Amino acid sequence: DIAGLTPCSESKAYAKLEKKELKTLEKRLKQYEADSAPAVALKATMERTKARFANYAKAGLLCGNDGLPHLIADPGLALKYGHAGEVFIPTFGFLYVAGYIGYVGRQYLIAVKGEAKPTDKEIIIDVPLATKLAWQGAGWPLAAVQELQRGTLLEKEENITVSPR
Amino acid sequence: GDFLVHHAIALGLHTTTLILVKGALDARGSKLMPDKKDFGYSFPCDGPGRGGTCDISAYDAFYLAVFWMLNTIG
Amino acid sequence: ATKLFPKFSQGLAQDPTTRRIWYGLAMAHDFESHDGMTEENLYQKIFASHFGQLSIIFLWTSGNLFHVAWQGNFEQWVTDPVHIRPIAHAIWDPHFGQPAVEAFTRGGASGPVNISTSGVYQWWYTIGMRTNQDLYVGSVFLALVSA
Amino acid sequence: WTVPTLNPDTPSPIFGGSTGGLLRKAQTEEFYVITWEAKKEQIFEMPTGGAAIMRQGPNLLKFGKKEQCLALTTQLRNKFKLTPCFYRVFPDGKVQYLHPADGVYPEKVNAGRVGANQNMRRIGQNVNPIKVKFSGRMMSPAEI
Amino acid sequence: KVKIAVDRNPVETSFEKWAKPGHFSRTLSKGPNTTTWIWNLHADAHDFDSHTSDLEEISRKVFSAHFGQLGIIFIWLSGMYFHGARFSNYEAWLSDPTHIKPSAQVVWPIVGQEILNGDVGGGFQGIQITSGFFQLWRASGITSELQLYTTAIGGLVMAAAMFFAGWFHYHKAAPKLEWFQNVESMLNHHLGGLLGLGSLAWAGHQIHVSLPVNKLLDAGVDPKEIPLPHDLLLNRAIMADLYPSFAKGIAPFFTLNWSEYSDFLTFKGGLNPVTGGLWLSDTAHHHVAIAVLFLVAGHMYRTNWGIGHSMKEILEAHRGPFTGEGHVGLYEILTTSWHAQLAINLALFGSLSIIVAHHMYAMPPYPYLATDYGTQLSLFTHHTWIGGFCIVGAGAHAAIFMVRDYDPTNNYNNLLDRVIRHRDAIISHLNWVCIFLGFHSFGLYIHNDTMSALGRPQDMFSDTAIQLQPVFAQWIQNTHFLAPQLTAPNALAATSLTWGGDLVAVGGKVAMMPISLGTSDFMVHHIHAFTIHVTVLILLKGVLFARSSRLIPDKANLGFRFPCDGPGRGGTCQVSAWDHVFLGLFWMYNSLSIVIFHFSWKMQSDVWGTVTASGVSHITGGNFAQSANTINGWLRDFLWAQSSQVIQSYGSALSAYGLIFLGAHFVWAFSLMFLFSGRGYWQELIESIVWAHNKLKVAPAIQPRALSITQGRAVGVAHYLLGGIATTWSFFLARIISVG
Amino acid sequence: QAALYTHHQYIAGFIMCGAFAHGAIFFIRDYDPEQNKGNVLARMLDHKEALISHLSWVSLFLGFHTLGLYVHND
Amino acid sequence: MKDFTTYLSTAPVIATIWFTFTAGLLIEINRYFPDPLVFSF
Ligand code: CLA
Ligand code: CLA
Ligand code: CLA
Ligand code: CLA
Ligand code: CLA
Ligand code: CLA
Ligand code: CLA
Ligand SMILES: CC1=C(/C=C/C(C)=C/C=C/C(C)=C/C=C/C=C(C)/C=C/C=C(C)/C=C/C2=C(C)CCCC2(C)C)C(C)(C)CCC1
Ligand code: SF4
User: Fold this and answer.
1) Which residues are listed as membrane-spanning (chain C)?
2) Please, which residues have CB within 8 angstroms of residue A23's CB and are 6 or more apart in sequence?
3) Where does residue E433 rank: exposed (0-12), middle (13-18), buried (19+ CB within 10 A)?
4) Would you call E110 an interface residue with chain G, using a CB distance cutoff of 8 Å?
């Protein structure tokens, strides 16, 4: 298939591991009563466990010889064989939120450098301004590419460089 | 497992290169001290002033790098 | 006082501490910073030192050949090498006790030998040695070259 | 002001006897001797440990290294406002004067001093250590 | 004339200074410009001598801070009683103490942590506690969860009382100085009131609640049928049923006919054979005698009437030929400085903690304590560590008194002066004895290792080869085992079973069996002596060389905490007394690690185990006498053999330990970056990253600075101790909760 | 096999560390700016903060993600 | 009351509040949606 494995639906090792986990869980379940909160929690665990196995089988995951899911990190390969939801979509999601955090922080820094005491507003957060900027950047990438294309993203060579060379 | 370990190895190489390259390029001088070239390679420190400067020589940068070499080959 | 050791650095052979001993051991191969060091003298010392290093290397290899040829079992190892273990050299330690020597005697030998985990046996079997005599000849030759 | 010599018959402050006194740097190499004149009896602190009582009038001590004389000098000067002077004594009967060695302690500038070890350039106007290489010994570029 | 002296409304109550960080000092106040200022804000928060220079204000500060500490302790106790009441299986434990393991914590069913809820027995699920509150509660007589809940509410109320008290005494009624400087009145009131009346009151509670309830519980009736304690207070005839002395009331006490109280104030020795704890009648008799002793001791000092002693007179009368003026001038030292008091009190406090640990494993006081192995190990280990830390603190604050508050003008010829005046002899001989013990105590192990590896086990130090017998400890052991027949005619047994004698077994397990002392014991005891002497060397050297030395003649003017005096005169890194405290911390870690390893392996090899009615089968089979003379013995039989449970705990209800194991290692190895390296390198690296921010206009307007030297060292030792101690914690708990 | 491979790996580590150490000694003792005005060797000294920054970045990235994945699997 | 709000505007208090918010948010998402590994949806 994809580098010599099989999907988990017909994977023999998958069902064996599933049976093993259910077995240990029922083994813990045996010694209590039928109304006890221990048995309530144990049956909740059974339900969550079997639901987890069904969810991993449903999403078309790929298992090796240990019966464990394997993720594929390759744009062409994952997009071709239907696996965009394990690395590709997660990486674009994370890059969105991480750039969002960074951009909000940077806008705060420039917003507070223009005052009379930049250190006080760094140690004592300007909460109205911080919430305001916390909203104002939900679309950051557009503002980022605009700041890039206007040449305000980068300071020129008035940065302090080490002396001497 | 090989994926994870190969990334650990790459971490070792990039880190050790960081320490060594930093020690080499900051050997002429830094901003903590802009006349490091007047002391030679392996000098102790510059004392408690300016917040104290322990292990500032290039010798001490290499000194720190040896530990990483041992780790990575480990 | 103004002691002799060491002669390469006068400022070092001046202080009345034990720093001079350690530093005299430490600045010996720093030819560039001795007293009166020109540039020609630097290159010449480096050249002679290279010769010293080559001598030590070849002498060491002669040592390996000699001990393998004398205390090892290379003559018996070439008949069946998926079997009888390599032998590096033999031990004579007066601190041993009875079960110690009874234990270390392994690989078909007659005394306390220890196994050669160096790969010299396979090297010398591949390149074309077969007996002890050839190894002795090699050892004598390499000692001569080192001299 | 001329260079004064000491009068070695002045009494010593009352003290019990520490461990931390003179070792054999004094027997073979040198030991330092301090002198001051007090106005009223008072308890001071030795720069070895313990407390001693200075006498009403001239006093006299003896120490191993120089930082001890400087410590006692700073303490007697900034706290009690006295004028001490300490010498250097070699172990055969030779006496060298020092501190102040100018009459005036070396903060108030006294006209008639010659400045030594005094380069006349900015700190970043030193030569590279490649251009002082291969000299008689190890040299810093700012030593030339 | 000792009296009350209080000032009115010194400091008003407003939030004004909460919005102004670093208001307390002149240096900190002006606001940040680097990141050193944050760590300086946290470093000098409690340095109450570094705000002002007046005794009175410092004293008021420390008084109210004490109230704060007490309040937080009450919140903690209230939490413990509440969690015992609501989220535990205490009643199911009272129904059957064996086979039902104590549990007092329940986790929430989220990402999978619900596997941590173990099958502790009794139809309950949760995390087994080793803190041993259940045995304490059964010793007090608590039978229901309702009483625990009431105690929880009471604790919370007392906590609020304490915080209000602190607020009151700093802001509304703040005492003057001379209130504090009446140490004699404080001694009388503490010795009498606190210790004595606490002992007397607790004796009352034992006699009237804990004796009868535990008598019924050990008699076999289940806890619900047992009468409530107020029925025991109100109805005399029930007590007359249990102990007939109570039928005579309090007539025997007031006519000196105390011999009739022999039913509930006893002197029998060993243990309760059905329980495994001490006899509670002994405990009550003990607190009664303690209370009489302390109430007698509390009338010793002169406060307002002519009788009693003065401290100055007692001190000034003791002076001999070898010590000049003796103690003249210690009273002025010990009433005008707080760091001296903190030094003495931390010293005796920590040593007291360690003695607590030793007596607490030797003579188990609580019912069903000795057969819960994890509780025994955890309690001994915990009190050991707390003692160690407190003693190191004593060293540190003695040093701080040497630096700051020492004035030689008031202190001329004196015990303190003479100690300073021969510090060289002191430290030299302490150094010698450290090296002597080092060579012998550790070279014995190296020699045994070498001989045992060279084929000749007949030339090593052991019980069968060349022998080293602790003859002294064995003789003392026999002396005390024989004591009930000659030198204690009225006891029925020895004070403990470790002195020798028979075996007490509760529910198949061993409560306590006699302990024998052989060659391995000799060697480990001298290891302990060696490490203790080394730590004493470091700390005492820090104290004596805190003001000046031959190296630095003016070390006093640099202060208590400073990094160096430059690379000159060879190099003077770490010359402050603070760094002596630092290295002392490392050695304290070492010594106490050895102590608790010794205890753990000795107990698992020679005391605990099951009574299978075929002799005694210990947990590890009794391999201490043959293996504790080789380092290979420790590394194999202890560390490698006993880690099988902490490394294989995955998948069971014990995996938290096998997962916090590795994290403890990680923090331990993380400390090494802070210890080994230095701040110049990090300063330059941080500068380059600051450039990488200057490029993108994210220059922080506060300036990034690397840690100062002292802080880097301190953080290093913090991580070091955290990682090491966490590792040992995880290992011990997994092992002894698994197999114990 | 084990001893040979381990031996040569550790030897390689020490040798590479020596290479960077003698780079640092070159910069301190034997470098001359005017002879090297504008070659690649001065260019490398001109933009060294970029080098150290990006080595720092890759070291951080590999560290966080490698250690994180290992801890998650644990 | 102004100074109390400014005290609430200091760094560690806002760190505590905001990290409680973020932690609780992630915890609730992990309760209502148990065991997420892939996105596919
Ligand atoms: C980190 C580097 C890297 C590496 C080693 C690979 C490796 C691979 N990619 Mg790939 N890829 C990457 C990054 C990478 N990808 C990125 C970032 C993108 C988004 C632009 C893609 C987009 C992509 C597509 C659309 C396809 C691949 C394919 C492949 C496979 C064969 C082609 C190949 O190796 O080209 C060498 C790759 C590089 C030198 C790295 C640069 C990345 C380029 C843009 C990808 C080249 C695709 C290639 C021309 C398609 C060849 C078709 C094939 C039938 C011959 C191989 C497993 C093909 C596949 O599915 O194989 C079965 C395919 O169709 N990749
Ligand atoms: C019988 C009287 C008495 C009692 C019981 C105490 C008890 C205590 N004093 Mg104390 N003290 C007394 C008289 C007394 N003192 C006198 C006469 C003076 C003046 C010379 C002082 C001066 C003094 C100072 C300066 C300090 C103490 C401290 C302490 C506490 C030590 C902490 C501890 O281990 O407590 C164990 C905990 C408990 C026993 C909990 C019980 C607590 C309750 C409230 C009992 C307290 C009784 C109370 C003092 C009586 C007056 C109450 C008030 C409403 C009038 C402890 C609560 C230290 C402390 O912690 O400060 C807060 C401290 O710094 N005391
Ligand atoms: C310090 C702790 C303590 C306390 C609180 C008690 C308390 C008690 N013991 Mg006791 N006891 C103790 C230690 C203690 N003991 C010790 C150490 C021993 C061993 C020697 C004994 C040995 C002992 C025996 C042998 C007996 C008791 C008994 C009693 C009870 C009755 C005492 C009695 O006969 O009248 C003593 C009288 C008083 C204490 C006077 C109380 C005055 C009240 C409280 C004043 C209230 C006035 C106020 C204005 C009222 C407000 C009115 C309005 C607001 C409503 C009483 C509950 C007797 C008992 O009942 O057995 C169960 C009994 O037989 N005890
Ligand atoms: C009754 C106990 C007691 C008391 C009242 C004091 C009081 C004091 N000590 Mg002291 N000390 C003690 C015990 C005590 N110490 C012990 C046991 C030791 C040995 C470790 C020391 C070692 C010590 C040193 C070495 C120094 C002091 C100093 C001081 C003074 C300033 C303290 C300060 O600003 O802290 C501010 C508060 C902190 C720094 C808190 C940080 C503490 C650590 C990092 C947290 C512990 C980690 C925790 C257990 C687990 C982490 C949980 C989680 C985050 C992972 C103050 C007078 C200093 C001084 O100069 O005095 C004038 C000083 O230099 N002490
Ligand atoms: C295992 C590592 C280790 C060892 C062996 C030592 C050893 C020592 N430290 Mg130490 N130390 C260490 C780690 C170690 N430290 C660490 C990590 C720290 C940081 C916290 C410190 C911090 C520290 C301080 C702060 C102090 C010491 C002190 C001491 C000395 C105590 C006296 C003693 O026992 O000497 C005896 C020597 C040994 C036990 C070593 C083994 C000797 C063998 C068994 C026999 C030797 C004979 C030999 C085989 C013959 C040679 C033959 C050969 C030439 C062919 C001793 C030299 C103290 C000191 O010097 O004062 C006394 C002291 O003040 N150390
Ligand atoms: C081609 C090989 C080679 C050559 C020719 C040189 C040559 C030189 N190096 Mg260099 N170096 C090399 C490889 C080499 N190095 C490698 C591989 C490293 C990385 C480790 C270094 C790291 C290095 C540093 C960090 C420094 C030099 C320095 C020097 C110069 C002075 C050397 C000196 O005085 O040392 C004297 C040599 C000694 C005192 C020997 C010390 C013994 C070492 C610690 C090994 C001990 C281990 C022990 C034997 C183990 C026994 C085990 C026991 C159980 C039996 C000299 C030009 C120095 C320099 O230029 O000064 C400015 C300098 O600072 N080099
Ligand atoms: C356990 C040992 C250990 C670890 C984890 C590290 C980790 C690191 N070292 Mg190294 N180092 C070590 C030992 C270690 N070192 C030793 C012994 C030495 C010899 C002195 C050095 C010498 C050294 C040098 C000289 C350099 C490093 C550098 C680095 C960084 C490399 C970048 C990286 O991997 O980012 C990954 C970072 C981490 C994994 C840090 C852990 C962060 C945790 C997971 C987050 C916190 C979790 C949680 C919130 C905590 C809650 C607790 C709460 C109370 C706060 C990184 C911080 C280099 C550097 O900084 O380059 C940028 C560098 O220049 N180190
Ligand atoms: C893919 C492949 C290929 C290719 C390969 C290649 C191309 C490779 C390369 C590689 C490389 C490319 C490598 C490199 C490395 C590098 C290094 C290793 C470096 C080092 C450096 C250093 C060490 C430095 C030093 C110094 C300093 C620091 C200062 C200055 C002076 C000096 C320079 C000395 C082929 C086709 C053939 C085949 C197939 C496969
Ligand atoms: S502590 Fe650091 S700064 Fe001070 S002398 Fe030592 S190395 Fe230099």
Assistant:
1) 46-69
2) none
3) middle
4) yes
Ligand 9: centre distance to CA E573 (Å)? 5
CA–CA dist C14, C32 (Å, integer): 20
Q: Please name the residue that has the structure tokens 């090498």.
A: C81
SS3 percent helix, strand, coil of chain F, rounded to 5, is 90, 0, 10
Q: Mind giving me the DSSP string for E506-539?
A: ETTEEEE------HHHHHHHHHHHHHHHHHHHHH
**Sequence-separated (6 or more) residues with CB below 8 Å from residue E698:** A105, A106, A109
Residue C61 β-bridge partners: none
Best mutation site among A72, A77, A87, A95 for ligand 1 pocket (most ligand atoms within 8 Å of CB): A77
Chains F and D touch (3+ CB pairs under 8 A): yes
Residue from E24, E42, E46 whose mutation best tests the ligand 4 pocket (most atoms within 8 A of CB): E46
Residue ranges making up the domain that contains G25: 1-41
- Chain D interface residues (partner B, CB cutoff 8 A): 123-124, 126, 128-129, 138, 140-142
Considering only CB atoms, which chain E residues are within 8 Å of C100? 454-456
Q: Which two tokens stand for residue D143?
A: 């030593």
Secondary structure of residue F1 in the 3-state scheme:
coil
Q: Which SS3 state, helix, strand or coil, does residue E703 take?
A: strand
Structural domains counted in chain G: 1
Distance CA E296, CA E123 (A): 52
- A160 CA to centre of ligand 4 in angstroms: 39
How far is D124 from B39, CA to CA, in rounded Å?
A: 14
**Distance between CA C60 and CA E415 in Å, rounded?**
67
- The angstrom resolution of this structure is 3.4
Q: How far is CA C113 from the centre of its chain?
A: 19
CATH number at residue G2: 1.20.5.510
The C-alpha atoms of residue F50 and residue A157 are separated, in whole angstroms, by: 13
Distance between Cα E427 and ligand 4 center (Å): 27
Atom of ligand 9 nearest to the CA of B52: 3
Q: Do F4 and C32 make contact, defined as CB atoms within 8 angstroms?
A: no
Method used to determine the 3D structure: cryo-EM
- Contact residues, chain C, for F29 at CB < 8 Å: 32
Cα dist. E263→E244, E247, E273 in Å? 8, 12, 18
* Structural domain of A159: 1-165
Which string of b and e fits D16-30 if b means at least 16 CB within 10 Å? eebbbeeeeebeeee
Structural domain count of chain A: 1
Alpha-helical (H) ranges within chain G are 2-8, 11-32
Distance from CA of G1 to the nearest CA of E (A): 8
Phi/psi at B34 (5° precision): -90, 15
What's the CA-to-centroid distance between E394 and ligand 4, angstroms? 12
User: Using a CB cutoff of 8 Å and minimum separation of 24, what contacts does A134-140 make?
Assistant: A134/A104, A136/A107, A137/A100, A137/A103, A137/A104, A137/A107, A138/A100, A140/A99, A140/A100, A140/A103, A140/A104
Which candidate, E692, E35, E693, A102, places its Cα nearest to that of G11?
E35
| Rounded alpha-carbon distances, angstroms, from residue E290 to A105, E243, E439 | 65, 23, 45
Among the partner-chain residues G6, G10, G38, the one whose CB lies closest to the CB of A61 is: G38
Q: Amino acid identity, residue E665?
A: H
Query: Per the CB < 8 Å rule, is B29 touching A160?
Result: no
Total number of domains in chain E:
1
What SS3 state is found at E272? coil
**Burial class for E378, CB neighbours closer than 10 Å (0-12, 13-18, 19+):** buried
3-state SS, residue D14: strand
